[PDB]
Amino acid sequence: TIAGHEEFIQTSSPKVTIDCSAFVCSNYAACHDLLSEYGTFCDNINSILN
Amino acid sequence: PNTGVYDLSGFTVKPVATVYRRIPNLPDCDIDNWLNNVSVPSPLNWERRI
Numbered sequence: 001t002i003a004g005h006e007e008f009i010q011t012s013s014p015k016v017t018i019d020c021s022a023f024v025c026s027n028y029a030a031c032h033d034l035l036s037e038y039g040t041f042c043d044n045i046n047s048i049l050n
Numbered sequence: 051p052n053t054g055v056y057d058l059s060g061f062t063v064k065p066v067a068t069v070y071r072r073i074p075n076l077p078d079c080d081i082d083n084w085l086n087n088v089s090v091p092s093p094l095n096w097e098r099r100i
């Protein structure tokens with residue numbers, strides 16, 4: 001006779017973007033002034049995710 | 051700058067319209083419900099409440 005069987009192969013994943021300054025220092029301007037001296041820390045996170 | 055898609059952060063602030071529920075302790079003393087009393091005593095027999 002003839003037998004059938006199925007398999008699944010994953011080829012993709014959900015694309016996740018993160019706003020780094022909104023996650024860390026949400027709406028508060030003092031937190032943004034403090035985060036501005038870590039500098040190239042949110043840009044590295046954004047470039048890795050891109 | 052180059053041809054691209056850039057993620058640009060916008061903001062919103064809100065300083066106004068606070069609420070401040072408190073569940074306060076005891077009921078107000080209501081001094082003014084005593085100082086606006088009708089029967090005012092004369093300087094011989096002044097009253098006092100604690």
Ligand SMILES: *[C@@H]1O[C@H](CO)[C@@H](O[C@@H]2O[C@H](CO)[C@@H](O)[C@H](O)[C@H]2NC(C)=O)[C@H](O)[C@H]1NC(C)=O
Nearest residue numbers: 082083084085086087088089090091097098099
């Ligand atoms: C003003 O003070 C007098 C106290 O001199 C209060 O008079 C009381 O009135 C009630 C009425 O039901 C009487 O049962 C009490 O015996 C009275 N007290 C005394 C000590 O006589 C009066 O209520 C006060 N006014 C207000 C608006 O609270």
